[PDB]
Symmetry: C3
Subunit: 309 residues, 3 copies
């Protein structure tokens, strides 16, 4: 009882990114060409061990059409058991935050053709997960990743989240805490994301907020944190499924008063569905980041085909 | 409706390459051992979307037995739609020239066990392709690759070709044009290849000519171009299928008069067929390159097994 | 007639490695976290060609859950024919020594959770193999790897082995000879391993001895060789299968008298079997290496899940 599964997706995209410097336009960087949107092929399977305890595993990989990908299991792969008790898995895993919201429904490579900039913190990691069974629309999940798997200048992280559905309604919560962290160091960093909306058929709408907190190792040890929000909504007419999403990131908070710049973006799109599996898509995007006076503004257009087999 | 397909092929080969320097033999480089002939495994699938419009995709990879290969989609992989209208595909593709001739029927790793030296220009690239349906034995194809996918010091290329069959007879044409190009720069480079022959069952024979043209960026801006030809023929007796191919490359043309050397090669071989899928092969090759006075001459022998599943 | 096969295995492990320096403890290096035990996915297939001659191939790869693996065919992959005559294969192969003993039944990544230190010489290589059919419990195998596949500072190696079973009883022999060899050079190096034991159902016990001989390129050209032994035994109660293995490496022999240190290790474990395919495992290990006065001592604990599909 094994399954070959995958998704194949690519198309043509184009961008332009205009720089400002407090007076007038500094430097443009146009580009256009064909990109793969993130195709993957994976294998998964399960075995019935009896009394409703079942064993599960999967190995999944990035299979870019362009041939740029390499390696096995670069995506979500694992081994675990599943049961009335729940489903426990270990392996490399989507982090609990990443499951939380379809923050980005888009298929695109470029960062201006989906609400990508709020999903940078979502990740996959080597960890243990307990995923809860659903009672009345409540489910829950927690996972952990030990220091040694994280590394020398990184510390164990904890992730937890909860999920709620009452028919159309839903709400989801996901959070993360890491003792220590570093970049080419910050401490006691947490992130909490909450999403809610309505998704019955013929009606999708959602909004969620991400708050991130980190304490800088400064010689001022300055608290910092950054907030962002996003709203997406689409309704499906017949075979055609228009959608649009918006996102803002308020200025970061540095030692005290907001010092960092804020970024606004909006994406408008459609997908036409040939079949449940094959659907063909079209996108266009706008982003302005940083202050109004000395900014950065970019725009892009994306069209693509997707086949899930 | 997915398919696992592949070809597995390897065997023992051996070579020797003797250098001359206008007087007498300079330096020999013998080598012998086992090589993989280029095994691949791929996945492909299609879905019927109705009214004879069908959606297709594939991801294909090099799967060398020796373990030397790495990555996903390093070979011809794509997503496209197929129809009465034609078949349009996008992704990484065999170039239209590469489909043109079975210039090399051989399986070998070494370059002296197939007519490899006329197939150096065949390639695969990230592009769009329109492939024509067949009316009376005519089909046609065109594809394009944009500057950005090509790169910083390379320019979009255009490929076109046409195909003809009347029973045994066939003829094929394939061409390529690229505005700009570079090596660790040439311009306005084109190549045209024409092949024709007869291939019914029990009779294969073919010949084709490749003309290549490039203008050097010189401080003489000197036109250059190079011509080559090849003839292959094999006939099948029962289960055994002898074949032989020959190839010559006339001297290149440099600024004016031919300055470059010309290379002659000939390959003689056989394949015994266990089954439609498994066939076992044997080869021997000769190549002399460069001038007669101060040349390079090499020879080699190849034996192999092939299984297409 | 193709098969997707594989094994998926991972779990949590932990170690500590204490160093001594002729007086008292120098330096400890603790580590704990989750490791993949060596999962693989492969494809294999065969075709009946008639009169009991069958053609076989396989391509196999390391598919670590953590995503650390890359490439195709990194494990045992080949193409060969199989028959009443025997089975001949060529490709990258397990070496004949490696097939000889289940010297290591363990699943672990760490080297202290299986009898790993006697299996360092087992390898895989690009070679030809003849594997013998079984008459009365005798089978035999030989293979060869040519200089060029081995490399510039390595020389062809020869491998041979024989196998015996009379019901519970078994005995196996495997050996290797290589003319020349090098490290970042030794000569005329051989290794011989003999294993015997009893394995009917509900009773496994085994012991084997590995002798290795190499002549150093020294300006004393000093003969050297090293011996090691291992014993493993497990019996299966119902669904639970305790096992324990021990290993010692006598001091190496250098020019004359034993100069090198000897390493002792012992591993104790169990596996609980959910199903023929899925089984869950638990391990604990001890190793002391080097002399008693100024040693190295390490210990570790391993728990894991395994699914063979």
């Amino acid at each position: 009882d094994v399954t070959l599964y995958g998704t194949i997706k690519a198309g043509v995209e184009t961008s332009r990114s205009v720089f400002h410097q407090n007076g007038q336009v500094t430097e443009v960087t146009t580009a256009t060409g064909i990109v793969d949107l993130g195709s993957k092929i994976g294998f998964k399977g399960q075995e019935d061990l009896g009394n409703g305890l079942k064993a599960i595993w999967q190995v999944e990989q990035k299979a870019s059409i362009a041939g740029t990908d390499s390696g096995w299991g670069n995506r979500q792969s694992f081994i675990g058991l599943k049961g009335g008790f729940g489903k426990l898995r270990v392996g490399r895993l989507n982090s609990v935050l990443k499951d939380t919201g379809d923050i980005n429904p888009w298929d695109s490579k470029s960062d201006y053709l989906g609400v990508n900039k709020i999903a940078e913190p979502e990740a996959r990691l080597i960890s243990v997960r307990y995923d809860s069974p659903e009672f009345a629309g409540l489910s829950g999940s927690v996972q952990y990743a030990l220091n040694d798997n994280a590394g020398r200048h990184n510390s164990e992280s904890y992730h937890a989240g909860f999920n709620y559905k009452n028919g159309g309604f839903f709400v989801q919560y996901g959070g993360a805490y890491k003792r220590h962290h570093q970049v080419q160091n910050i401490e006691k960093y947490q992130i909490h994301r909450l999403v809610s909306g309505y998704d019955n058929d013929a009606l999708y709408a959602s909004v969620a907020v991400q708050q991130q907190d980190a304490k800088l190792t400064d010689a001022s040890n300055s608290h910092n944190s950054q907030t962002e929000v996003a709203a997406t909504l689409a309704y499906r007419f017949g075979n055609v499924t228009p959608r649009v999403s918006y996102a803002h990131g308020f200025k970061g908070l540095v030692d005290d008063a907001d010092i960092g710049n804020e970024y606004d973006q909006v994406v408008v799109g459609a997908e036409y569905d040939f079949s449940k599996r094959t659907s063909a898509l079209v996108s266009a995007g706008w982003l302005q980041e940083g202050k109004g006076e000395n900014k950065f503004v970019a725009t892009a257009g994306g069209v693509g085909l997707r086949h899930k087999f």
